Ligand binder design. Structure first.
Ligand SMILES: N#Cc1ccc2nncn2c1NCc1ccco1
Lengths: 364, 29
């Protein structure tokens, strides 16, 4: 049975009144430090701090110079030299921006994606390795220290339509991607080819050479299945050695490549089988671009629906049916919940909506 | 079971990331 109970302690609506697509707490902040999160919507990036008695303190606002930009995602990192926090944002333009959260200044940007960017994820061990997933059918790996495009994941056996999500595993040995082509693809980045490609990107010096850096083109995934969902796959995350993915079917499917007893690291690229282990059911989440989330220790799973309900499950409960905690509803929360974020310690859950509203749920 | 086995994998791997986080002192924002 589920233990976790929450209480809605505060809400706010942003001035632009545009949909909020993404939210992320900064999990790099040191124990004790004020709990900060960023929200993205329209051509805005906004920072907030969480104080006692459900107080949400506005810190800084970033308004993009391009009025037509529509941010879809953000991800936090830190500079590996200065220990300074960094925030990457992207959207409709297909331009990645590295923002200094303290000054709200665009430090650097990366062009190259031929279409919109749906997701940005930083490597769990390397703060410089940023992955971007795009409408151009590809995923790209960047080294934001050397400003290089390390690799492009797509081509011959890559995605055949817009890529919607991706996730690194806990240790960052492999990435799982998914898109509109209904497929879920595995790309190992711990292969000798990729580990060397990563090293090469660190050795690259533009003031010591005239030739630009040569990115790797990964045309072939290490695993591919179109047998989990019957439609578009808009969200994917690793749950240990298992996968969690959703479509429009009002369920988060928990599965693994190959047969039940197959090892994730011994799965051959040609693997034709796939094992479905369970399902996390909900309702009113048939619209596109609705992401689920997990807390750091991967104990809680959260997903918002199109009507303002926040479903929460206890991932320590073996059966996904007796794992569902009390749904987090507030009679005033009625618009689509696009994304949720747990604070590092899982004491706070923030939810963002289509009506520019933020919702703070504090654990009991 | 597969569940309990997957659960320990998460425990150990999140513990490796948590230790690396503890050894870090990221400046406030
Ligand atoms: N949230 C959101 C969003 C909204 C509109 C939109 N139009 N093109 C891409 N878009 C998004 N992308 C983020 C995303 C990809 C998969 C799941 O959320």
């Amino acid at each position: 049975k589920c233990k976790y109970s929450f209480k809605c302690v505060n809400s706010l609506k942003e001035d632009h009144n545009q949909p909020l697509f993404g939210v992320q707490f900064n999990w790099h902040s040191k124990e004790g430090d004020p709990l900060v999160f960023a929200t993205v919507g329209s051509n805005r990036v906004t920072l907030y701090e969480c104080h006692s008695q459900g107080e949400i303190r506005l810190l800084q606002s970033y308004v993009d110079a391009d009025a037509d930009e529509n941010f879809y995602t953000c991800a936090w990192t830190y500079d590996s030299n200065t220990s300074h926090p960094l925030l990457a944002v992207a959207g409709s333009r297909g331009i990645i921006r590295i923002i200094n959260p303290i000054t709200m200044q665009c430090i650097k940007h990366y062009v190259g994606h031929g279409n919109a960017i749906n997701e940005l994820k930083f490597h769990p061990r390397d703060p410089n390795l940023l992955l971007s997933v795009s409408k151009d059918h590809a995923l790209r790996l960047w080294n934001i220290q050397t400003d290089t495009l390390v690799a492009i994941f797509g081509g011959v056996e890559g995605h055949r339509d817009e890529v919607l999500s991706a996730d690194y595993d806990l240790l960052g040995e492999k990435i799982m991607s998914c898109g509109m082509d209904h497929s879920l693809k595995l790309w190992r980045i711990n292969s000798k080819r990729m580990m060397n490609a990563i090293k090469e990107s660190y050795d690259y010096n533009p003031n010591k050479t005239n030739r630009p850096f040569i990115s790797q083109k990964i045309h072939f995934p290490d695993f591919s299945t179109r047998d989990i969902h019957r439609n578009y796959v808009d969200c994917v995350r690793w749950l240990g050695d298992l996968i969690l993915s959703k479509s429009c079917e009002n369920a988060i499917v928990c599965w693994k490549p190959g047969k039940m007893e197959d090892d994730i690291d011994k799965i051959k690229p040609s693997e034709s089988n796939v094992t479905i282990l369970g399902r996390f059911d909900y309702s009113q989440c048939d619209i596109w671009y609705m992401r689920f989330s997990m807390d750091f220790w991967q104990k809680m799973l959260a997903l918002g629906n199109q009507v303002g309900k926040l479903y929460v499950w206890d991932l320590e409960v073996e059966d996904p049916h007796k794992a569902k905690c009390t749904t987090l509803t507030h009679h005033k929360c009625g618009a689509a919940i696009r994304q949720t974020s747990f604070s590092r310690d899982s004491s706070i859950l923030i939810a963002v909506c289509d009506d520019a509203s933020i919702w703070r749920w504090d654990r009991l | 079971s597969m569940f309990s086995s997957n659960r320990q994998k998460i425990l150990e791997r999140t513990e490796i990331l948590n230790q690396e986080w503890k050894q870090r002192r990221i400046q406030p924002v």
